[PDB]
Structure formats: structure tokens, C-alpha cells
């Protein structure tokens, strides 16, 4: 049971060992498409690639490759697309994927500039009056509005398929204070943000999978998805004791490599799930408390 395990790992100081056993046990599947010469400039990092079996294929129209994976959680009945931060030449591909996969929400857990370097392209418009046209994939993207909080921003975007003139509203949930290879400020800050994504309807099974990304699309993105899936599993069953967090992470790692990149991110995931369980099991009042503790205003 997660809280008993947490306390035992903490008391024995064994987060590093627990985390390394996950790394050891994790699936290794081929990434031959990602490694084709023609795809080199579509990958941000040499050592982060989608497995062939779970990669998202683009439907246009000479190279179907994007560095993105479908994390299909069968038991939880929820799917996520995890992807790297788009590159200057892959922003059209990114929005093509969003369109084709019928995603309603994009969750971004990094900043464009981190530690002096460009870790993600500026792939969405910052001003209403300066829309973006992706000529390669025939899409237009307009900023409709934004709600700027202290450590996250929610944007309403309009994505238009220029070939058909169909438009869709996309919600962008941007966590602006989650350091690379780091953790959120508190369980409260994290959960307040997760619940904002959930409240939007973006995770509904009536939509395509939410797109979640950071820079590599594995460390921060993996932490987010693990917490969400574990909370969903216990919610479906109304049984916190039924959820085996390490098993869930190993299952997710069947679909994309390297999910959760530090031992402290794993530790944080446990803290987030244990805290979120209070809400799932009927203490409604905790949600307001998280909002207060997150100092979002
Ligand atoms: C310190 N690592 C790096 O800077 C690069 C590039 C990079 C950048 C930023 C990262 N953080 S993220 O995913 O944006 O939150 C993660 C990584 C992962 N990296 C990797 O090389 C991943 C290698 C890897 C690949 C697959 C599995 C594992 C694992 O043992 O968990 C590790
Ligand atoms: Cl940014
Ligand atoms: Cl910086
Ligand atoms: Cl970039
Ligand atoms: Cl950072
Ligand atoms: Mg203005």
C-alpha cells in the first residue's frame, strides 16, 4: 500500500535504489524509425526516441515521423500522447498531430528557455493579432484568450484546418515553474494544476488523448501522467489500496522510454497521489485548500 511503502522507503533512505530498480526493469523496444537518417533533425535529443510500436504516425504525406508516443492505459481507460518540445521545423507536425488525434488539450510542463538554452520552440502565438500559419501542414493557429496565474497560464487557442476550414478550440495548460529534473513546489501546486486540466474536460474519453510535453517528453511529462493515472485508477475503484504506483509506471514505460527522470520525481509522484487520494475519497474541501496553498493569484 502506497503510504506504508512511502514511509518505509523514506525511513530507509532508499529512493535512489527503488528508482534504479525501475530503470533496470523498464521495457526496451526498438526505435528504428526514430533513428533513420532522414529523421535526425526531427529529434531534439539523441537518446530520447519513441518506440516504433507506440509512436504516433502523422497522416500527411511523405514522412510520417514525429517524436511522440501514445501511452494507452488499458485498465485506467485513459490515453495520453507524450512528445518532446517541438523544434523550429516540427511545429507544423506537432499541430498536425493534435488535429489528427482529435486532442482537446495540450499540457506544457517546461519553459521555452531553461538554463540559458532553447528547450522548446515558440509553437503557439503569444498575441491575438499575430496568428501562426503552418504552411507545411496547412493549419492556422490563433490565440483567443489567456488566463495568467502566478505559476501557470491557461490559453484558449483556435486551430483551423485550412484545407477544410474546420476549426477547433484547443486548451493549452502551461506550468511555468517546474524546473527541469526537478519537482513542483508542493503537492498542492501540482494538484491544483492537474485539477484545472481535469475540470476543463480535456481528459474526457469523448476527445482524443491529451498531449503532454516537457522538453524531452519524459521526466516532467511522466510525473504528470503517473499521478493522473494513479488517481484515476483509485477513483474508478474507490480503493486507494488497489493502486501499485511502481507497477503503473512500469506499464507506462512500455509505451515511452525514461518516464520519470529522477528519484525525487518518483517520490513526488507518491506524495501527489497520496494527497490527491483525499479528494478522490470524498474530502471535497481539500481542492480549495490546494488552491490557497498554491498561491495562484
Ligand atoms: C540527463 N539527460 C539528458 O540531458 C537527456 C535529454 C533530456 C532533457 C530534459 C529532460 N527532462 S524533461 O523530460 O524535459 O523533463 C530529460 C532528458 C533526458 N536525456 C536523456 O539522455 C535520456 C536517456 C534515457 C533514456 C531512456 C531511459 C532513461 C532512464 O534510465 O530513465 C534515460
Ligand atoms: Cl515559456
Ligand atoms: Cl535561463
Ligand atoms: Cl527549439
Ligand atoms: Cl529549469
Ligand atoms: Mg495585446
Determine the distance separating the centroid of ligand 6 and the alpha carbon of 127, expressed in angstroms.
Answer: 6
Asked whether 222 and 258 are in contact (CB, 8 A), the reply is yes
What experimental approach yielded this model? X-ray
Read out DSSP for 107-126? EE-S-SEETTEE-S---S-S
Instruction: Assess whether the C-beta atom of 220 lies below 6 angstroms from ligand 1.
Output: yes
Instruction: Assess whether the C-beta atom of 180 lies below 6 angstroms from ligand 1.
Output: yes
Residues composing the chain: 297
Instruction: Assess whether the C-beta atom of 17 lies below 6 angstroms from ligand 1.
Output: no
| 229 Cβ contact list (under 8 Å, min separation 6) | 73, 76, 78, 248, 252
Question: How far apart are the C-alpha atoms of 160 and 133, rounded to whole Å?
Answer: 9
Q: Identify the nearest ligand to the CA of 180 by its number.
A: 5
Other beta carbons within 10 Å of 282 = 9
Question: How far apart are the C-alpha atoms of 162 and 157, rounded to whole Å?
Answer: 15
- Write the DSSP symbol of residue 127: S
Q: What is the separation, in whole angstroms, between the first and last Cα of the chain?
A: 36
At 229, is the secondary structure helix, strand, or coil?
A: helix
To 5 degrees, how large is the angle CA 66–CA 70–CA 75?
180
Determine the distance separating the centroid of ligand 4 and the alpha carbon of 121, expressed in angstroms.
Answer: 4
Closest CA to 103 of 196, 197, 200, 203: 203
Instruction: Assess whether the C-beta atom of 47 lies below 6 angstroms from ligand 1.
Output: yes
Q: Which grid coordinates belong to 143?
A: 490565440
Resolution in A: 1.5
57: which strand partners?
65
What pairing do the DSSP bridges indicate for beta strands 105-108 and 166-175? parallel
Calculated CA dihedral for residues 20, 68, 183, 275, nearest 10 degrees: -90
The pair phi, psi for residue 151, each rounded to 5°, is -130, 5
Domain 1-297 has CATH 3.90.190.10: yes
Q: Which residues are within 5 Å of ligand 3 (an ion), measured at CB?
A: 116
Asked whether 172 and 106 are in contact (CB, 8 A), the reply is yes
Q: Which grid coordinates belong to 278?
A: 483525499
Question: In the chain, what are the helix, strand and coil shares in percent, each to the nearest 5?
Answer: 40, 20, 40
Nearest CA to ligand 1 atom 27: 258
Closest CA to 248 of 277, 217, 270: 270
The pair phi, psi for residue 292, each rounded to 5°, is -60, -50
Question: How far apart are the C-alpha atoms of 44 and 212, rounded to whole Å?
Answer: 16
Calculate the alpha carbon distances from 139 to 1, 97, 150, 203 in Å. 47, 11, 31, 23
Calculate the alpha carbon distances from 209 to 34, 245, 296 in Å. 21, 21, 27
Peptide bond just before 229 cis, omega within 30 deg: no
Amino acid at each position: 500500500e502506497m503510504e506504508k511503502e512511502f514511509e518505509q522507503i523514506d525511513k530507509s533512505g532508499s529512493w535512489a535504489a527503488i528508482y534504479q530498480d525501475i530503470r533496470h526493469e523498464a521495457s526496451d523496444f526498438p526505435c528504428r524509425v526514430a533513428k533513420l537518417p532522414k529523421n535526425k533533425n526531427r529529434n531534439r535529443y539523441r537518446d530520447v526516441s519513441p518506440f516504433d510500436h507506440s509512436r504516433i504516425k502523422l497522416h500527411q504525406e511523405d514522412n510520417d515521423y514525429i517524436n511522440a508516443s501514445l501511452i494507452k492505459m488499458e485498465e485506467a481507460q485513459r490515453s495520453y500522447i507524450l512528445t518532446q518540445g517541438p523544434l523550429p521545423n516540427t511545429c507544423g507536425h506537432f499541430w498536425e498531430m493534435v488535429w489528427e488525434q482529435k486532442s482537446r488539450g495540450v499540457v506544457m510542463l517546461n519553459r521555452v528557455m531553461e538554463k540559458g538554452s532553447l528547450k522548446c520552440a515558440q509553437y503557439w502565438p503569444q498575441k491575438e493579432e499575430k496568428e501562426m500559419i503552418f504552411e507545411d501542414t496547412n493549419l492556422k493557429l490563433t490565440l483567443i484568450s489567456e488566463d495568467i496565474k502566478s505559476y501557470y497560464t491557461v490559453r484558449q487557442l483556435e486551430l483551423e484546418n485550412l484545407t477544410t476550414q474546420e476549426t477547433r478550440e484547443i486548451l493549452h495548460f502551461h506550468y511555468t515553474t517546474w524546473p527541469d529534473f526537478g519537482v513542483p513546489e508542493s503537492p498542492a501546486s501540482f494538484l491544483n494544476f492537474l485539477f484545472k486540466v481535469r475540470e476543463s474536460g480535456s481528459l474526457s474519453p469523448e476527445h482524443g488523448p491529451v498531449v503532454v510535453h516537457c522538453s524531452a517528453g519524459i521526466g516532467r511529462s511522466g510525473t504528470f501522467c503517473l499521478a493522473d493515472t494513479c488517481l484515476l485508477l483509485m477513483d474508478k475503484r474507490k480503493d486507494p489500496s488497489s493502486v501499485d504506483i511502481k507497477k503503473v509506471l512500469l506499464e507506462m514505460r512500455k509505451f515511452r522510454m525514461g518516464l520519470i527522470q529522477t528519484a525525487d520525481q518518483l517520490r513526488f509522484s507518491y506524495l501527489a497521489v497520496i494527497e490527491g487520494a483525499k479528494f478522490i475519497m470524498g474530502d471535497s474541501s481539500v481542492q480549495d485548500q490546494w488552491k490557497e496553498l498554491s498561491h495562484e493569484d
